[PDB]
Amino acid sequence: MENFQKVEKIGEGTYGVVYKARNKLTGEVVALKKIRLTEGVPSTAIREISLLKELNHPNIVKLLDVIHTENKLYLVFEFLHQDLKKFMDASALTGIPLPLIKSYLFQLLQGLAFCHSHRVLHRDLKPQNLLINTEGAIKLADFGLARAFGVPVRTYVVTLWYRAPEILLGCKYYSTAVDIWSLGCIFAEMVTRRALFPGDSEIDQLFRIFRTLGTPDEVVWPGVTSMPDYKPSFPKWARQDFSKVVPPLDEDGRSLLSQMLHYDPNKRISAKAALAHPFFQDVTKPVPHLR
């Protein structure tokens, strides 16, 4: 711990504080996550550490070290230049170019396919948890809510806007599909510059999803009318033409997005399968313009 120089605060929350820091001996720039620390090591830190240690992939943020004193606990991460949320705002006037959207989605799916095939669910995929550098990389971050699904993970979380319909309807278990739902929402947000389903509440969130994608029935999604939080009195909305939901997308993007937003979590495309979608046939690695 004496080898690190604090440069500046980069975040704060219930966990503790996050600092940009420098290694005094090697010069390495790092993100220091400091956990306050009589309840012991927090459950989220136990999970975040043991899961990330297993996950070495170029599109997942590296845990560089864990320093465990008697009364403080530090998580040392590689440092990236900003989050997608901050990038999307900077891009509000100009837009993010479509080849860069494609590159980002492609890399996000690679990181996620890696997580999923290593039995880790992320569960909290949102623009501010995705980190970018100036050389065109995007990486999943904040595995504070991540879970190993060697056995199925029961439902308790994730911010509302990116929450899958099956969770809102009160399914018993999570599945990999919840993460794909989140990426699909983020994909559309990059394209339109607007949150796809920005709800005030759980019920407003469902209703926004329904108004766009159609109110699901037993044909579309078997078992749906039997789910704990389904109501017969739900309004029955028509599905909307995707050319009106994400106008600047070609046929291939609309295809992928609708498969990512598929109602039935059993038939919602996987990250693995999404990587082979004709949408990524001409994927390149463009460099973003960061402020």
Binding site: T38, S43, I46, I49, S50, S117, H118, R119, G150
Partner: protein, 257 residues
């Protein structure tokens, strides 16, 4: 979703080798024995029931204990402290929300203090180098259960029952990887309930033939047959519940052919 099952299985098969304890560790522990370990694990089972924790939690805790005892000498009076800390860690990893520390001190019957449990937690984490996501028999059974034709809750509960029994006896079960014990537990449960055998699809998926499972199957059959006469009874009592279809009351077959 079907896509990831193979990659996950392959990964767990890889991870179970890295997360295995040393097989002859108990011989190198001057003050503790297999018998004491059996008492401890049986107690943890009770703890699991009393606090309504998942079976996965129990399995993970045992893995942590066995790994910890693979590199640290422990005196008999401190074994339960290692046990409690492992259970607490397992809870923190696996449970939606774990019981608070005070509840874990309560079950020791005031033997150790809060401070002691938390320091042991720190120590176990240090010794295990934070590697807590260990593959378990439970995980493999879960994977294997998808190859049932069709699914049978009696089979599942009995497989779970036999797998849990394997946790009690370090001799012989430390000799076997979780994927192997699960292989045996699955076939034995399948054979007892339905008369079917370790299915072709699992042979292809796991690479294990029925023949290759034989040594472990012979041990597990013996455990199963002798279960009512074992000193440790918590698991049998657990599996009398209708929750698990009272499978621990099912008569085991006399031979395996």
């Amino acid at each position: 979703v079907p896509d990831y099952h193979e990659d996950i299985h392959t990964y767990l098969r890889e991870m179970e080798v890295k997360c295995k304890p040393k097989v002859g560790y108990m011989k190198k522990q001057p003050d503790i024995t297999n018998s004491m370990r059996a008492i401890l694990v049986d107690w943890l089972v009770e703890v699991g029931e009393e606090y309504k924790l998942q079976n996965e939690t129990l399995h993970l805790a045992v893995n942590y204990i066995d790994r910890f005892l693979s590199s640290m000498s422990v005196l008999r009076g401190k074994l339960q402290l290692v046990g409690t800390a492992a259970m607490l860690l397992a809870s923190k990893f696996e449970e939606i929300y774990p019981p608070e520390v005070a509840e874990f001190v309560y079950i020791t019957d005031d033997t150790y203090t809060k401070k002691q449990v938390l320091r042991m937690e720190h120590l176990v984490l240090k010794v295990l180098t934070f590697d807590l996501a260990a593959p378990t028999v439970n995980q493999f059974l879960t994977q294997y259960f998808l190859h049932q034709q069709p699914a049978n809750c009696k089979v599942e509960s009995l497989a779970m029952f036999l797998g849990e029994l394997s946790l009690i006896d370090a001799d012989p079960y430390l000799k076997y990887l979780p994927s192997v014990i699960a292989g045996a537990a699955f076939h034995l449960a399948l054979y007892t309930v339905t008369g079917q055998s370790w299915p072709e699809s699992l042979i292809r998926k796991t690479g294990y033939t029925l023949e290759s499972l034989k040594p472990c199957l012979m041990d597990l059959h013996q455990t199963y047959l002798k279960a009512p006469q074992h000193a440790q009874q918590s698991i049998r009592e657990k599996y009398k519940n209708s929750k698990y279809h009272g499978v621990s009351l099912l008569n085991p077959p006399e031979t395996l052919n």
